[PDB]
């Protein structure tokens with residue numbers, strides 16, 4: 035294949051666009067560039083395409099959350115309450131892990147097919163930018179291949195942020211990558227960090243039978259930008275499921291022991307209150323950071339911001355104007371759909387089009403049960419900016435679909451601009467949050483008012499009616515069903 | 517309370533407490549109208565709560581979980597169960613708990629909103645008066661400025677077949693069968709029939725639906741969608757006889773039923789025996805004993821009450837909404853008509869576009885749609901483009917291993933305006949509400965594809981089908 039240039043393929047090539055990395059940013063940018071008429075190359079170092087999201091991220095984590103949630107429903111009260119009677123429910127963890135790998139495998143292979151269908155040249159190698167118009171790929175056999183290119187698109191992604199003095203071995207001290215592949219349910223697990231990723235993987239193992247505590251330096255669960263009331267109610271729900279939390283707590287260190295266990299040393303974040311908690315697996319997920327190793331940036335003189343990111347303009351140009359960057363290597367929320375959207379518009383701009391994105395319209399989702407999802411501003415952001423607003427809330431306990439399914443934790447909260455009725459934020463805690471937020475993203479895109487939303491005919495019975503009614507309550511002062 | 521009868525004085529008197537009427541009464545009260553709601557049955561909530569959307573969704577949900585457990589699905593995810601039993605009584609009890617909770621909820625919302633509840637059979641006895649007659653013959657007279665008729669629908673009978681709710685059931689009896697029938701025949705493969713048929717098939721019944729028309733899913737379903745849907749349900753074990761009329765059914769001495777059918781064009785007579793015959797050929801508007809003939813309000817040839825765009829009958833202080841009037845017979849349509857009818861009584865604008873009203877079928881896979889089908893755009897001569905995106909290329913669906921179906925988007929050639937959206941597959945019911953928002957906005961396919969959808973979501977299929985209709989290709993397929 036002209037379309038696959040792996041070890042032993044080392045002839046010089048030319049391209050209009052050369053994308054470095056095949057994660058959500060890069061693979062979508064490559065496909066789009068080819069569809070716009072650009073002769074396109076995508077360079078990837080790993081054995082599969084799809085990056086962090088496909089291989090060790092969104093995909094395998096959602097598979098395990100979907101399966102562990104079914105396990106919990108089968109194993110607990112839920113199924114027996116519906117007349118579905120089982121003698122024994124057993125965990126087969128090999129088999130659940132196989133369902134996960136099958137999905138990854140299919141989706142990673144899908145990308146390769148898409149690249150082929152759209153004539154994207156896939157170079158398997160490590161790409162280094164060796165001049166303003168050139169990338170050199172080094173291959174697994176030591177070989178090298180030069181790409182002569184008009185434009186370069188950096189989409190090199192992120193890595194796990196290491197924790198100083200705790201060495202991640204992916205055995206009993208694991209990152210998200212090793213958490214996704216434990217070979218047995220651990221009796222006790224400590225999670226360092228109660229961000230989205232930690233909460234999700236913690237919840238997975240907790241449902242499968244682990245005792246789980248998450249330790250977090252900050253005062254709230256679910257990461258940056260989550261509305262505080264949502265976070266607090268979410269926390270409370272997770273705690274009743276048996277997830278434990280130590281917030282405002284730092285981890286001062288950890289030690290592997292002769293019994294095989296791990297003593298985690300912790301104290302209050304302000305100072306004081308030393309304790310040790312002991313666990314079988316220690317999951318370290320304090321963060322992710324941009325990945326730009328060996329890319330050639332220093333030599334080209336592209337300087338990083340202090341967090342490791344590549345500074346870009348509104349068209350995603352670095353300070354060298356034919357060298358662009360997107361996704362988790364640049365500023366903004368480190369999310370797959372944000373990387374894909376940046377990819378698309380970057381490459382559209384290279385072809386002549388307009389380039390604007392507002393990160394406020396980027397939703398977030400936590401795929402626990404209940405789910406959490408939001409888009410636009412939190413109440414904390416509105417107070418900080420001096421914006422005057424009204425609140426509408428509608429609990430899932432008063433929604434008919436949620437009541438019929440007997441799945442009624444949570445609420446929708448809508449934040450509207452006090453004078454104009456403009457929808458400023460939507461926050462959803464409960465069943466179907468992750469799908470429902472997309473209706474809210476559509477509305478924010480057009481600048482909808484809470485009234486416009488409330489006037490749209492939503493299907494009955496649907497979880498979406500909670501969204502409709504929280505808008506009606508923001509707009510009119512009261513909903514119909516609560 | 518209870519110490520020569522006294523009339524109630526009201527601004528608005530609502531006859532019926534289903535989705536249309538209960539909602540209209542709450543809203544009226546919230547707008548400051550002194551409001552009364554009359555209901556003849558023992559509980560509030562009408563067809564939807566008591567014998568309709570609610571109990572049917574409860575059984576669909578629970579039977580689906582039963583099919584996942586009893587089948588291979590849970591095994592495949594490493595959830596290993598030694599034996600899986602149905603306890604039908606307990607599944608029915610979960611259904612009844614949901615119904616009871618929600619019907620009591622409405623009584624509570626009428627108290628919270630100061631809606632006066634009258635329990636009786638309501639007859640309009642004057643341009644400004646309704647009389648309710650209780651089950652014991654006691655009368656309550658309400659003298660009222662406006663009257664809102666929200667008297668709903670009933671089961672359409674099949675001529676020559678008598679439903680007795682025992683072996684020959686309507687939807688109501690189908691929802692309370694005491695035991696899984698060995699064999700069931702369903703007359704009608706519309707939304708209600710497909711749903712209740714699927715429930716009982718998952719529970720172990722051999723189910724066949726017989727339908728006069730050539731497609732499943734009822735009126736206005738897109739044909740491509742409908743064919744694909746029927747294929748999937750056939751692979752689940754649900755059998756269909758399309759282009760087939762039922763000529764009659766005989767209640768046999770041994771307790772079974774003999775159903776006679778043949779081709780809808782003519783010919784091919786055969787008889788199929790079953791244990792339960794579900795008759796679901798339709799629903800019709802219910803106006804019995806309401807006093808219309810005496811006020812001079814004539815019905816249309818289908819039995820509906822003709823109203824203006826503000827929901828006024830020919831007597832302008834008497835209104836009608838929901839399943840008793842024209843347009844799709846759906847709960848959310850009745851609810852919207854009730855809210856806007858009462859806003860219009862306070863002097864505001866009244867707008868509902870029926871083309872924007874979604875439909876959902878709560879089978880697994882779900883089906884849902886809003887706006888126009890390909891068939892409708894062809895009849896109207898509209899030039900359009902098509903985008904399709906299969907759930908098999910959707911990340912979330914693939915991750916869940918639940919990958920039947922597709923999103924299909926119909927776009928206008930000249931302007932890129934979205935004209936219809938059609939969803940077969942996981943999450944279709946909730947997904948159609950983003951689609952309804954788009955159809956209401958007259959949004960363009962280009963703009964919907966540009967909106968930042970969360971990854972991985974089933975909604976990305978919707979986003980990419982829009983992309984495909986607008987630019988001509990999607991990213992992931």
Ligand SMILES: Cc1cc2nc3c(=O)[nH]c(=O)nc-3n(C[C@H](O)[C@H](O)[C@H](O)COP(=O)(O)OP(=O)(O)OC[C@H]3O[C@@H](n4cnc5c(N)ncnc54)[C@H](O)[C@@H]3O)c2cc1C
Pocket residue numbers: 054055056057058059060061077078079080083084085086087088090091092093095159160161162189190191192210231325327328329360361362363368369370371372373401971972
């Ligand atoms: C456990 C977990 C769960 C998550 N869940 C979600 C979620 O549910 N939703 C969501 O939106 N986000 C989620 N994320 C975040 C999401 O994975 C990232 O935001 C996303 O993958 C970033 O895409 P990208 O294209 O910028 O980078 P990456 O996916 O990190 O892809 C970078 C690619 O570049 C390659 N590469 C780097 N340097 C070079 C080089 N010099 N030459 C060649 N190749 C190179 C890497 O091998 C990699 O394949 C999750 C992440 C984790 C870890």
Ligand SMILES: Cc1cc2nc3c(=O)[nH]c(=O)nc-3n(C[C@H](O)[C@H](O)[C@H](O)COP(=O)(O)OP(=O)(O)OC[C@H]3O[C@@H](n4cnc5c(N)ncnc54)[C@H](O)[C@@H]3O)c2cc1C
Pocket residue numbers: 494495531532533534535536537554555556557560561562563564565567568569570572636637638639666667668669670687708802804805806837838839840845846847848849850
């Ligand atoms: C099995 C089944 C499943 C369904 N699934 C769905 C679905 O999933 N989604 C959907 O949108 N729709 C669904 N429907 C349709 C929905 O039930 C109706 O469209 C909706 O209930 C109509 O609401 P309404 O307020 O017009 O009438 P109705 O709900 O039928 O309420 C009419 C009420 O008026 C009362 N009444 C009538 N005359 C008088 C009188 N003269 N005095 C006092 N009271 C009176 C009745 O007793 C009843 O309570 C379903 C229906 C059925 C049968």
